């Protein structure tokens, strides 16, 4: 489950390499009421995420700011 | 509304969700110690904030 | 100087209880060595009392399964008390197993080559349902000292099953032990003293390994009395 193989996997005649990261699974639905804390808190790391994007966005393109400014 | 006996506990760990069930009240012979919880019980609060 | 004690007779007038002589031992000493040998072979022996059980079909040890006359509380308190060598390795596991009418003893208890039981004719508890039947699990490890159910849930390796029933455990191989001094043979000479020790034993341990285990032990941590 952690990295597939198709060396040993000779019953599935190795349809990819060994050791191919891509996208081979899918799943289809959570819910997740128990791991509202987790989600939670998820959430607020990818708004911390999107604000610093954001902030690198706004300011490094113009090299920060050229401007009087205060503290 | 009403709120809730579930397992929906936020904060707290692994080993303290352990020992309930999935509708939130321990199993029968459960040798629980001193801070601990025996039924997750969780209630709705006012929004106060958006 | 000195005359070296040497154990010279040993006296098994019971299966439960022996006693135990030493020859010449100088005035002054008969005080010394037993009081001291006393003390320490009450204190500290290699015990292999019972320390957890996993019965068949209960959840805790203060409810009833049905068909056995004692609760599941008197049931534990009883097996605290059955006394069990070990010789193979420090831990094993034993299997029990009956049905019918009538009590189980230590005699029922499976009896593989390793293990060895003293006391057969001890009473674990009565039987009176025709179809009631039991299968408990019982671990016994070695060890010494008194340690108590409360302070062993230090360990937190998820030792949680339901099943699994934990006990006071009981380390100690002596029971009652007795010593006096008295004058010993003529030696040709005056003033000869000889000790006699009455030990009082559940029968795990002979009293001559005893006695030789509690001497090492007295010796080997006095050694440390060589200063700078």
């Given at each position: 489950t952690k990295e597939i193989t198709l060396e040993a996997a000779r019953y599935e005649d190795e349809s990819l390499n060994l050791g191919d990261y891509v996208e081979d699974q899918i799943e289809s639905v959570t819910f997740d009421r128990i791991t509202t804390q987790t989600a939670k808190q998820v959430i607020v790391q990818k708004v911390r995420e999107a604000e610093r994007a954001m902030v690198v966005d706004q300011f490094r393109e113009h090299e920060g700011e050229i401007i009087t400014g205060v503290v | 509304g009403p709120e809730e006996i579930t397992a929906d506990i936020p904060n707290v760990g692994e080993a303290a969700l352990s020992k309930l069930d999935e509708s939130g009240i321990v199993y029968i012979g459960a040798e629980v110690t001193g801070g601990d919880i025996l039924v997750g019980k969780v209630t709705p609060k006012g929004e106060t904030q958006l | 100087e000195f005359l070296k004690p040497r154990l010279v007779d040993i006296e098994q007038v019971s299966s439960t209880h022996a006693k135990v002589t030493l020859e010449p031992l100088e005035r002054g000493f008969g005080h010394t060595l037993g009081n001291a040998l006393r003390r320490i072979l009450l204190s500290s022996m290699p015990g292999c009392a019972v320390t957890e059980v996993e019965i068949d079909?209960?959840?805790?040890?203060?409810s009833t399964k049905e068909?056995?006359?004692?609760d599941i509380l008197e049931i534990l308190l009883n097996l605290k008390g059955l006394a069990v060598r070990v010789q193979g390795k420090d831990e094993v596991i034993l299997t029990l197993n009956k049905s019918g009418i009538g009590p189980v003893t230590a005699a029922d208890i499976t009896h593989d080559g390793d293990v060895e039981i003293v006391?057969?004719?001890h009473v674990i508890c009565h039987l009176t349902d025709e179809n009631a039947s039991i299968s408990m699990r019982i671990k016994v490890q070695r060890g010494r000292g008194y340690v108590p159910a409360?302070?062993?849930?230090?360990?937190?390796?998820?030792?949680?099953?339901?099943?699994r029933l934990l006990v006071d455990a009981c380390?100690?191989?002596?029971e009652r032990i007795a010593y006096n001094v008295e004058a010993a043979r003529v030696e040709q000479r005056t003033d000869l003293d000889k000790l006699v020790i009455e030990m009082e034993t559940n029968?795990?341990?002979?009293p001559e390994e005893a006695i030789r285990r509690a001497a090492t032990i007295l010796a080997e941590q006095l050694e440390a009395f060589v200063d700078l």
């Open positions: - | - | 079909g209960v959840l805790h040890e203060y068909g056995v006359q004692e006391k057969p004719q409360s302070t062993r849930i230090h360990s937190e390796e998820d030792e949680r099953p339901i099943g380390y100690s191989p002596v029968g795990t341990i002979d």
